[PDB]
Enzyme design. Structure first.
Site, short mmCIF file in Angstrom:
data_model
loop_
_atom_site.label_atom_id
_atom_site.label_comp_id
_atom_site.label_asym_id
_atom_site.label_seq_id
_atom_site.Cartn_x
_atom_site.Cartn_y
_atom_site.Cartn_z
N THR D 144 0.93 -1.19 0.27
CA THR D 144 0.27 -0.17 -0.01
C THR D 144 0.75 1.31 0.33
O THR D 144 0.48 2.27 -0.80
CB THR D 144 -0.79 -0.23 1.56
OG1 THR D 144 -1.32 -0.90 0.82
CG2 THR D 144 -1.77 1.04 0.97
N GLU D 253 12.21 27.82 0.81
CA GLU D 253 13.57 27.33 1.46
C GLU D 253 14.03 26.40 1.45
O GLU D 253 14.99 25.87 0.74
CB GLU D 253 13.98 28.52 2.14
CG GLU D 253 12.99 29.41 2.75
CD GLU D 253 13.25 30.53 3.37
OE1 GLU D 253 14.53 30.76 3.68
OE2 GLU D 253 12.71 31.85 3.53
#
Ligand code: GTP
Ligand code: GDP
Ligand code: GDP
Ligand code: MG
Lengths: 426, 49, 50, 436, 426
Positions: D144, D253
């Site tokens: 999964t 950033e």
């Protein structure tokens, strides 16, 4: 306008200078908070020689400290009259020389002298009419002798014709508190021969003898010896700070005392140095001052003047006295002893007077003699150095530090030729 | 470990080689300027005479 | 491979130490030459004023 | 400045269980949805808005979706200590597990649940104004996390694209791993993990066991213990958007500073100081030594020596009382150190973000109370070793065609097996040339 | 009559400007609630150079804040002296630059510069006799660098004859705050050099070293570095606001400091600086101020002022001094070391004198040197740029938002030839 930059090298020099600054601050009448709390105006017209002004009337000494352990600076900060010092001069390392003179002249110099020289240069360009420097140190240790010697050489190279006083306490056989005294003492006097312009020799042996005979104290700690040295220090520079009837400045004293360039080791005394009990029974006259002067039990150096000949002598009196009495006493002593005074210098004694006496006392008189008997200390140090160096004892601690048997033999040879010159002139 | 050390050492030696070359150029320039200034001082000495 | 690696590493290290000592000497000479430069400048200024 | 998170598989939702066990106490939210009326820890109404969105009077709902196919664990989350916290529809649970079959989780089962998950992802981004990006928690070491995780990843990339994707992927361990067929699912997921996810964070099971055995001295750690510090790292790297510091760097950033090249986004991770409850005080804790411990290979969340690799860039997130001077003093000594070496293709390689908030301690936890913390995330070339050893693991299973039929009879042909290995090899050779 | 417009771009710029307005408000005596409580009446006379007095006595400053995240505005409006700024002076966006010069200059600037120019034009036309603009920003940032220089170009195109002051904090070799600084630094300087009238270059390592060596601080933070920069700025803008014997406004400073159109990069400094424990030990005497000014450890740049030559220098003194004194040391310092000044320029130094010392002192001085040793930081940044651009590192973050590589190549060429033209004046 005349300038004497103070420098204190090592623990001994630092403590002696601290006591000396206490004495000078007391003499000029300034509180340990830096302000002025004196009465007479005459304490204020010559403060500039030994104190830089700061904003608000706070006077601060023109002194620089130099060592390698923070503990000495901590002690000076903690002690009274310690805060007056400018914290811009407390320069130090973090390792300590370990009394390894080679280390203190070759291994911490390269990291502390580049800063101490900057500080001393700033303090010497602060004022205009430089007379010279006053360095307090011990010619027995590692950082009191190595760094002090290299610094004296540096100031010699930077100021070629300014006078350096080196107040050097010399180790003695009966006060040898460390085992490696001669290796440092010989190597230090080796360079102090070329470098300084007048060296006054002091020794704890004679200091303790004085404290046991004159004062007849019971427990003379280091404080009282420091007080004696500080009183002599503050009494030898009275002509620069105070008016007199026959002045005597630094170069005058030098050129009077030293006949030949290599002969600049002096022995200094002090009068009146009297016990608390027997002081109340004695009135102080100029003949009394000169008797206590010439008496060998008063010299601060363990050198016996009647074992040789006086080259020159000098007497700095302090007190409203009579010049005829002073001169007649000096010539009376010269006529009494016609052999201990050298034959070819007529009236080898020099005398001078200042007005203001030290606080408390009414009259005082410091004595500086260039006796030739001082060769005994140098020859004994040379003998001990040869005894220890004949088998390279303790030598590896310097050999692995940078110096060599060549330099050690050179130092011994310089000591031998110094005592040779003394014996030749005697 | 070894390759890390050689990489670091090569970078250091290159940087300090560059600094050595800069010092060499600085010394050459200083020698030239001292030559010029001493010649000027000689001219001024003769003018003083 | 790794022993050859370390051997060349060590010889580079010794060469770098040699060149580092050389640059220290060069820096000392540069400081002396700065001293000489400024001294000659001062003397020239004095002579010009004269 | 709000960020939503998705948790797929079982590892993802347990890590999310830890994360939302930590955020609630860190923002002071009682574990039912409403802030306490009496006590007010901290302040700043907008501080919690990143992870918890207010609803109505006083109930705060999270910004995560826990999606899984096997209901055995989602039901545990449903009935556990967090019932009134989450939203009844943000817990998506199918009927049958992916059963470690990547093809089954990708095509058969996953195709009828990814759209349902998207129907809620969109409606959760609708009521968010300053959306920042996505955060995915999963382990590709199964069916999964790999299958449905990939499927959702590319289906989100095709739909939004502009918003960044921060992944925290728990790869198979060096040796101490659970499933036998991971070396298939790992490559099958990495092929779509290179060019779709933006910034991936490598996680290992063995390395965090080693950290728990040498730092907290719990000689028998467990998944709860590991997920707790995983959540701590996640909070320590997302603290910037929430708590105001002098030098604070958010997701954008952090992304634009650490990814020098398009596909070189494969990072390490470390946290300091992982210290037991008893040794919280006997050790002198300060910036120098916590930063020093932030680089030691024994304190790395992925079992690979950084000494094998050359750093390209690093970021250090500081928490609590940290003056912005000793940080530079410490990075100077880091540069002067000899074991760790950068690459000449980058002269400045540190981004030292700082925030004024001390780390939080979960009640009855294995981590002590410390006045500060450091979360280190850095790009490095040593992950090529991880990918190389996993390639070696895949080759033996592929040359004997083992386990292949469980895939080919569910929908995936041999072509994906071939191309995923080829692209992992291309990744490894790219790391080689970049480290060159 | 004259007016000054302050601009704050970037987080660093916003914090620096907040501290600057704190200092200026303290100096003119306005409390943080916008009202007036100054005592003397020599302050209202020039209080209009900064503050647009509004109906109700709310003297609001003339400064404009610009960035891409409301966090900086939260901080500024929360901190002390925050309730005096204007609500209109809080123009912003909600996206964030993230250090990418492309985002700073193209992606967000192209739509926020209209908003910033609206307010700038409003203030500039509300103030009648404009003097210039001055902006405080960070060269290594994304909002203070990219959008900053974009606004710089816009406003310089708008007003041709009004001069620009740029307090720009540049990258650092030792305190490497960010990874991709060199790109932003090069791309901002390449834009600035055309539009820069005076560029005060600053950096954080040369201020950390000041706070740890001269001021002798334990925790040097931004709350101190910004304070030092604020002190320097207030010293710069003193002749306009206060009277004196010898005024020197911004145009006089520029004319005295710029000998060629492409030589404008100033290193700044402020004196006196003393340790808190030694404040009251040295006298604020005009010489002492002068050898504090002409110091390497008292600059604000990574460059060594003794590693080159001074083209021109300017010194703005503040307080009650004597012009004969000031000029005598200004000439003595230039006669002493003749090798550090340009030979082909007599009178390398200007010395202006104000007549109101700043609050908390008796006198002060601000140094601004247009020396040629400033090229070293540009050389360091350019070689970093070579080391990065040699491999197109991080290039996609620029090239994916409106950039080409031609700008990079031309920026390399511009930095190279600028450092060359600095070098050839030696
Ligand atoms: N660190 C950590 N690792 C976990 C945790 N839970 C599971 N893992 C590991 O991560 C992998 C993920 O579990 P999976 O086998 O993929 O189970 P799943 O994710 O639900 O996928 P399927 O059950 O196959 O549908 C497992 O192989 C475990 O080894 C956890 O809570 N913490
Ligand atoms: N007058 C005085 N003499 C001291 C004191 N301490 C030590 N001495 C003596 O003077 C010498 C000083 O040596 P020292 O200063 O320790 O050497 P250094 O460490 O290299 O500076 C020693 O040999 C002691 O015998 C002191 O406090 N006062
Ligand atoms: N000296 C100083 N530097 C600062 C301050 N604030 C930020 N900086 C530096 O400025 C750089 C970032 O510039 P910044 O203002 O954030 O630009 P932005 O990223 O576009 O907002 C960082 O590397 C910091 O080191 C401050 O108050 N003082
Ligand atoms: Mg499952």
């Amino acid at each position: 306008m005349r300038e004497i930059v103070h420098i204190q090298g090592g623990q001994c020099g630092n403590q002696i200078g601290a006591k000396f600054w206490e004495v000078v601050s007391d003499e000029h009448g300034i509180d340990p908070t830096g302000t002025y709390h004196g009465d007479s105006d005459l304490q204020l017209e010559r403060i500039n020689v030994y104190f830089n002004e700061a904003t608000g009337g706070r006077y601060v000494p023109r002194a620089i400290l130099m060592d390698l352990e923070p503990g000495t600076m901590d002690s000076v900060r903690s002690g009274p009259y310690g805060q007056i010092f400018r914290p811009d001069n407390f320069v130090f390392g973090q390792t300590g020389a370990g009394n390894n003179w080679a280390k203190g002249h070759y291994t911490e110099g390269a990291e502390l002298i580049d800063s101490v020289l900057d500080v001393v240069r700033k303090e010497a360009e602060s004022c205009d009419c430089l007379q010279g420097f006053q360095v307090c140190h011990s010619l027995g240790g590692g950082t009191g002798s190595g760094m002090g010697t290299l610094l004296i050489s540096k100031i010699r190279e930077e100021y070629p014709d300014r006078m350096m006083l080196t107040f050097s306490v010399v180790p003695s056989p009966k006060v040898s508190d460390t085992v490696v005294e001669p290796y440092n003492a010989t190597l230090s006097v080796h360079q102090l021969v070329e470098n300084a312009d007048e060296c006054m020799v002091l020794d704890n042996e004679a200091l303790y003898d004085i404290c046991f005979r004159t004062l007849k104290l019971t427990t003379p700690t280091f404080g009282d010896l420091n007080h004696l040295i500080s009183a002599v220090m503050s009494g030898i520079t009275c002509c620069l700070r105070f008016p007199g009837q026959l002045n005597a400045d630094l170069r005058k004293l030098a050129v009077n005392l030293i006949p030949f360039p290599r002969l600049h080791f002096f022995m200094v005394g002090f009068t009146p140095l009297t016990s608390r009990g027997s002081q109340q029974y004695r009135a102080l006259t100029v003949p009394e001052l000169t008797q206590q002067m010439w008496d060998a039990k008063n010299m601060m150096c363990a050198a016996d003047p009647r074992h040789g000949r006086y080259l020159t002598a000098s007497a700095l009196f302090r007190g409203r006295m009579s010049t005829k009495e002073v001169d007649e006493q000096m010539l009376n002593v010269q006529n009494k002893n016609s052999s201990y005074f050298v034959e070819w210098i007529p009236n080898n004694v020099k005398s001078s007077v200042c007005d203001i006496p030290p606080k408390g006392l009414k009259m005082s008189a410091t004595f500086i003699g260039n006796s030739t008997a001082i060769q005994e200390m140098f020859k004994r140090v040379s003998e001990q150095f040869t005894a220890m160096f004949r088998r390279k004892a303790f030598l590896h601690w310097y050999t692995g530090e940078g110096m060599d048997e060549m330099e050690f033999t050179e130092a011994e040879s310089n000591m031998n030729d110094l005592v040779s010159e003394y014996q030749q002139y005697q | 470990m070894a390759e890390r050390e050689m990489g670091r050492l090569k970078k250091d030696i290159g940087k300090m080689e560059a600094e050595r070359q800069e010092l060499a150029d600085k010394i050459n320039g200083l020698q030239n300027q001292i030559y010029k200034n001493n010649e000027k001082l000689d001219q001024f000495k003769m003018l003083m005479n | 491979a790794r022993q050859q690696c370390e051997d060349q590493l060590n010889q580079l290290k010794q060469q770098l130490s040699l060149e580092e000592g050389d640059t220290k000497g060069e820096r000392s000479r540069v400081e002396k030459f700065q001293l000489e430069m400024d001294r000659l400048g001062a003397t020239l200024k004095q002579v010009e004023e004269y | 400045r709000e960020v939503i998170s998705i948790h797929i598989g079982q590892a993802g939702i347990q890590v999310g269980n830890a994360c939302w066990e930590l955020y609630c106490l860190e923002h002071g939210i009682q574990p039912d949805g409403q802030m306490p009326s009496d006590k007010t820890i901290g302040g700043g109404d907008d501080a919690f808005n990143t992870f918890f969105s207010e609803t109505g009077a006083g109930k705060h709902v999270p910004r995560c979706i826990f999606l899984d196919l096997e209901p055995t664990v989602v039901d545990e989350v449903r009935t556990g200590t967090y019932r009134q916290l989450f939203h009844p529809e943000q817990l998506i649970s199918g009927k049958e597990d992916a059963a470690n079959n990547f093809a089954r989780g990708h095509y058969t089962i996953g195709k009828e649940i990814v759209d349902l998950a998207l129907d809620r992802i969109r409606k959760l981004a609708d009521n968010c104004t300053g959306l920042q990006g996505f955060l995915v928690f999963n382990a590709v070491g199964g069916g999964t996390g790999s299958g449905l995780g990939s499927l959702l990843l590319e289906r989100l990339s095709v739909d939004y694209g502009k918003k960044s994707k921060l992944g925290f992927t728990v790869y198979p361990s060096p040796q101490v791993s659970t499933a036998v067929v991971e070396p298939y699912n790992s490559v099958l997921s990495t092929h779509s993990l290179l060019e779709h996810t933006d910034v991936a964070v490598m996680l290992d099971n063995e390395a965090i066991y080693d950290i728990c055995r040498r730092s907290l001295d719990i000689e028998r750690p467990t998944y709860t213990n590991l997920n707790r510090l995983i959540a701590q790292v996640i909070s320590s790297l997302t603290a910037s958007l929430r708590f105001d510091g002098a030098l604070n760097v958010d997701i954008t950033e952090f992304q634009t500073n650490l990814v020098p090249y398009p596909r070189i986004h494969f990072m390490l991770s470390s946290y300091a100081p992982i210290i037991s409850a008893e040794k919280a005080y006997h050790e002198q804790l300060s910036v120098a030594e916590i930063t020093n411990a932030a680089f030691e290979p024994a304190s790395m969340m992925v079992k690979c020596d950084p000494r094998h690799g050359k750093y390209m860039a690093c970021c250090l997130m500081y928490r609590g009382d940290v003056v912005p001077k000793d940080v530079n003093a410490s990075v100077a000594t880091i540069k002067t150190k000899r074991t760790i070496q950068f690459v000449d293709w980058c002269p400045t390689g540190f981004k030292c973000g700082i925030n004024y908030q001390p780390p939080t301690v979960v009640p009855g936890g294995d981590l002590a109370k410390v006045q500060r913390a450091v979360c280190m995330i850095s790009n490095s070339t040593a992950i090529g070793e991880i990918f190389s050893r996993l390639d070696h693991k895949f080759d033996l299973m592929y040359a004997k065609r083992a386990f292949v039929h469980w895939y080919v009879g569910e929908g995936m042909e041999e072509g994906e097996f071939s191309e995923a290995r080829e692209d992992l090899a291309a990744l490894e050779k790219d790391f080689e040339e970049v480290g060159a």
